[PDB]
Design a protein around this nucleic acid. Structure first.
Ligand SMILES: Nc1ncnc2[nH]cnc12
Ligand code: SF4
Ligand SMILES: [Ca+2]
Length: 346
DNA sequence: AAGACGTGGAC
DNA sequence: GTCCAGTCT
């Protein structure tokens, strides 16, 4: 019922679509930025960040020209920071080799960093009307129920079948709305738990409702257990009130974000005190707390300490005043290190 | 193929 | 506690 569906869906969309910030216009830059911020992050959490981000980086060019350190700062607390580094590059590429005009050709836009199959379709379909499908988690949930597909949505293969299923039922007349409509539906109706089928605008066409198995779809593999990793962190202060920080390595975990000197303790303050060299003296642990990641959990332990000078501060390290820390981008884990330390000493 | 890659907010 | 939750390698 390719046509009956669209009509029922698109309409529901027209009257139920939320008035979200990135929906004010169809500007390719705005859309692209929100689509990237929304990856594995909830809309409510993204709204504030989006607004600040665009306020500070009004256009693709403004973003293109900004120092990456600023870019990270703007992303501070959002998670999966590699996303903004990829967007910063992609943009710099679009300014230089594309005349500041975001490609409207799948193959083209797709070569930019951070732009996978989903982004290509979301951005080009909503902003440029290109009929490419935009299949993400929500869409896969919706489609898997509508058509009763029981394949693991983890398999990129499934992503392709779902994508194929979109190429045949979408409303080629208005792809962008069809694609967002499908996404809103999964967001406000066809939810992960307790989907509201009784009031769904497309309940009809839903094989899953007919069979009473909607709450059992989509089929997903259960996440495995994550590694637990203890970490020693040093909060070193001068006599004048200056702390020691370093910029993490540009590749891997929390890439390019600043932090307080740390090291894996498989080791106590000994293992940490060693890494210092320097000229630092540490004492008993101020506190110990956890901090989860997708693939592991940090077992943190703070160690206070005085920093006596005796040489330059080079390498990744950097001497910084207290009224200047708030300018660096730190992971949520170390923002708590400082918070714990500051209330301790006060 | 499957692990790497943040962080928070419902149940 | 668990589920949610794209792209790069
Ligand atoms: N364009 C969009 N609008 C609302 N929620 C979304 N989640 C992912 N893309 C979205
Ligand atoms: S009927 Fe229920 S399960 Fe089917 S699409 Fe609508 S909300 Fe989703
Ligand atoms: Ca690509």
């Amino acid at each position: 019922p390719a046509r009956e569906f669209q009509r029922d869906l698109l309409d529901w969309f027209a009257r139920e679509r939320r008035d979200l910030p990135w929906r004010k216009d169809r500007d390719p830059y705005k859309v692209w930025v929100s689509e990237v911020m929304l990856q594995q992050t909830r809309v409510e959490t993204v709204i504030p960040y989006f607004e600040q981000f665009i306020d500070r980086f009004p256009t693709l060019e403004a973003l293109a020209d900004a120092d990456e350190d600023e870019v990270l700062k703007a992303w501070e607390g959002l998670g999966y920071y590699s996303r903004v580094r990829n967007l910063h590059a992609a943009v710099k590429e679009v300014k230089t080799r594309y005349g500041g005009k975001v490609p409207d050709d799948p193959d083209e836009f797709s070569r930019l960093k951070g732009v996978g199959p989903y982004t290509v379709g979301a951005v080009l379909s909503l902003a440029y009307g290109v009929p490419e499908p935009a299949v993400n988690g929500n869409v896969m949930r919706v489609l898997s129920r509508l058509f009763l597909v029981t394949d693991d949505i983890a398999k990129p293969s499934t992503r392709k079948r779902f994508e194929q299923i979109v190429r045949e039922i979408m409303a080629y007349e208005n792809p962008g709305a069809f694609n967002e409509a499908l996404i809103e539906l999964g967001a406000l109706v066809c939810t992960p738990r307790r989907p509201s089928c009784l009031l769904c605008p497309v309940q009809a066409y839903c094989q899953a409702f007919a069979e009473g198995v909607a709450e059992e779809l989509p089929v997903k593999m259960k996440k495995t257990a994550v590694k637990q990793v203890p970490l020693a962190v040093a909060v070193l202060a001068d006599d004048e009130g200056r702390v020691l920080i370093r910029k993490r390595d540009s590749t891997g975990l929390l890439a390019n974000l600043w932090e307080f000197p740390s090291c894996e303790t498989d080791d106590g303050k000994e293992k940490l005190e060693q890494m210092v060299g320097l000229q630092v003296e540490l004492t008993e642990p101020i506190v110990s707390f956890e901090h989860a990641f997708s693939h592991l959990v940090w077992q943190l332990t703070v160690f206070p300490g005085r920093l006596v000078h005796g040489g330059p501060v080079e390498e990744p390290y950097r001497l910084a005043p207290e009224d200047e820390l708030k300018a660096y981008a730190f992971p949520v884990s170390h923002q708590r290190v400082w918070r714990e330390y500051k209330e301790w000493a006060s």
